[PDB]
Write a protein that binds this ligand. Structure first.
Ligand code: 402
Ligand code: SF4
Ligand code: SF4
Ligand code: SF4
Ligand code: SF4
Ligand code: FES
Length: 578
């Protein structure tokens, strides 16, 4: 073929789009509607408009390149078209970058600044109670910001295949939301927040728990514990312009101490706990040989998915609480027993890459003695804001350490944040448990990677068992619907709602669609975790000294009596009715 773009001739044989072919060279083409190799098929943004000699203005997103084409990307007509579309977008956009939370990384602001567009009538409503949906424990919607972009809808479509995010005809207007515009919590939505991740504006956000944190930090009698997720230490640095794949653990600890937090712990400790329990009940599930298989229950999105699509699998879920909740359970029981704190005056805060964790911490039965397990959950973005508003020079902070009592962790817990991490961590301990032997080879590298469905065979104590790692909700839907589950007898299965693991959660830093061509965000984020794993001396959850101490002096032996009654939570399917 022969292509002419801006006068320059290209000879190629690639069968792609104009946008892609131009971006594989250095021809700039603005785009808003195009993401995840999909565009809004109904009201196309036409931001990627170019001019094909003989045809006219076309959208480069969904236009295949052909011989004889002469393309213009910056002719007068093209830019008047784009400026037109952007102005039209501004006509329904409250561009009060006044207190906006997408200010420092908004794509729409970038487009407006680029083409210098202005609205014909500035959109400024008296009340916004009509445009705002904050009923959800995990999600908030601000339609004063929405561009009717479709990117959220497509993202939900391809990450979950649930279509919990729909287009809706709300009394004349076209909006986005849930089934019958009810609250997301009340639908089949997984609250995985991958809607937020694909959103270019402040239209979709996480339900904020920041004031919840401050009102505890300023409360005199309130002793505020804080513990972060595995992924956070490998992601938050991005929001402070530090680059991709940077370990900022010590910096995080320092910032948390500078924010007024009374105790610095880590959710990886709880990941080690979850491994203790889960490996134990895996083995007592072994020489019972049932009920097989056993699914992981640490991902709240996968939990909600099961409840809404496969409740007959709820009994096959592990009764062991997720790292967050199993940490919260110990911080209100065991931690006062080694600190002398009135447990009622204890306030546990987790830093998460997830948004579903909010819905998981506000579950009615996540209590004992009236006391919550987790009182507040903030995301990576929330922690970043909370740091910036305190004007804490994060990128230049020196490294601290957490508090060891429930803060130190093993390499097994360190890789939870990746897909296949829970699998590997569980196997390392379960094998030693069943064989009564401290094995040396602990790296299970078949379950790693970004493949959708991963399968492996392992032999625990001279007997072979089949394990599977599901990487993404849509992949769970595929794994079940395509009958792969009823192929071979599976024995242990890991499911993560977000493709790539928790490192790609709904509460993670928004990455520009023009840094994504450069960086494999999932692998780059996971790299830190996998390195932390190997450079740690203790690489198994039952090798965490603090955890062991905890188990001997409070919980007793795992999977039993005390440990079972306090540290576990099981899901019950609704009984048959009509
Ligand atoms: N609780 C919990 Fe987990 C742990 O530890 C996080 O904290 Fe994950 C991460 N990173 C998230 O969000 S959840 C499901 N499993 C694997 S990792
Ligand atoms: S969401 Fe972005 S474009 Fe919209 S007002 Fe806020 S900063 Fe400006
Ligand atoms: S909420 Fe965001 S991603 Fe979804 S259509 Fe509106 S602007 Fe696009
Ligand atoms: S949280 Fe997940 S399932 Fe719910 S609308 Fe967003 S992408 Fe879809
Ligand atoms: S995979 Fe991790 S970040 Fe995504 S919904 Fe599950 S727990 Fe949350
Ligand atoms: S980016 Fe091509 S129509 Fe939206």
């Amino acid at each position: 073929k022969t292509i002419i773009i801006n006068g320059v001739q290209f000879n190629t044989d690639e069968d792609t789009t104009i946008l892609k072919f131009a971006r594989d060279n250095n021809i700039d083409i603005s785009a808003l509607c195009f993401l995840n190799n999909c565009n809004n098929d109904i009201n196309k943004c036409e931001i990627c408009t170019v001019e094909v000699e003989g045809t006219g203005l076309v959208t480069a997103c969904d236009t295949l390149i052909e011989d004889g084409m002469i393309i213009n990307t910056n002719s007068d007509a093209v830019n008047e078209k784009i400026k037109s579309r952007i102005s039209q977008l501004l006509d329904i956009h409250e561009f009060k970058c006044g207190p906006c939370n997408r200010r420092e990384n908004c794509e729409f602001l970038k487009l407006v600044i680029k083409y210098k567009a202005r609205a014909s009538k500035p959109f400024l409503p008296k009340d916004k109670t009509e445009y705002v949906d904050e009923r959800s424990k995990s999600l908030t919607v601000d339609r004063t910001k929405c561009l009717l972009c479709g990117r959220c809808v497509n993202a939900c479509g391809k990450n979950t295949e649930t279509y919990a995010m729909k287009f809706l005809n709300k009394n004349g207007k076209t909006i986005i939301g849930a089934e019958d515009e009810k609250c997301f919590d009340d639908t089949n939505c997984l609250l995985c927040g991958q809607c937020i991740i694909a959103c270019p504006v402040a239209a979709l956000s996480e339900k904020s728990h920041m004031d919840r944190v401050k009102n505890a930090l300023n409360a005199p009698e309130k002793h505020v514990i804080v513990a972060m997720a595995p992924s956070v230490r490998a992601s938050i640095g991005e929001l402070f312009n530090m680059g991709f794949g940077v370990d900022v653990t010590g910096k995080i600890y320092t910032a948390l101490r500078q924010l007024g937090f009374d105790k610095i712990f880590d959710i990886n400790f709880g990941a080690d706990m979850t491994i203790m329990e889960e490996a134990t009940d895996l083995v007592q599930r072994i020489e019972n040989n049932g009920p097989f298989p056993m699914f992981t229950s640490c991902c709240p999105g996968w939990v909600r998915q099961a409840e809404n699509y496969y409740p007959e699998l709820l009994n096959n879920l592990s009764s062991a609480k997720s790292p967050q909740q199993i940490f919260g359970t110990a911080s209100k029981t065991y931690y006062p027993s080694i600190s002398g704190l009135d447990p009622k005056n204890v306030f546990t805060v987790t830093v998460m890459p997830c948004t579903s964790k909010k819905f998981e911490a506000d579950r009615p039965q996540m209590e004992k003695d009236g006391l919550r397990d987790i009182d507040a959950v903030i995301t990576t973005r929330e922690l970043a804001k909370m740091i910036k508003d305190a004007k804490i020079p994060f990128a230049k902070l020196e490294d601290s350490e957490a508090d060891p009592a429930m803060g130190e962790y093993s390499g097994a817990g360190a890789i939870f944040g990746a897909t296949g991490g829970v699998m590997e961590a569980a196997l390392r301990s379960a094998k030693d448990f069943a064989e009564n032997a401290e094995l040396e080879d602990i790296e299970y590298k078949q379950v790693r990677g970004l493949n959708g469905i991963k399968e492996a065979e392992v032999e625990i104590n001279n007997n072979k068992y089949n394990v599977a790692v599901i990487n993404g909700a849509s992949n769970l839907f595929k794994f079940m619907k395509s009958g792969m589950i009823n192929e071979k007898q599976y024995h242990f299965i890991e499911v993560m709602a977000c493709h790539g693991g928790c490192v790609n959660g709904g509460g993670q830093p928004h990455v520009n669609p023009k840094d994504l061509e450069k960086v494999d965000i999932k692998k780059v984020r996971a790299s830190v975790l996998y390195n932390q794993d190997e450079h740690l001396s203790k690489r198994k959850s039952h090798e965490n000294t603090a955890l062991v101490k905890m188990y001997q002096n409070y919980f007793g032996k795992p999977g039993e009596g005390r440990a079972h009654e306090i540290l576990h939570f099981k899901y019950k399917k609704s009984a048959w009715s009509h």
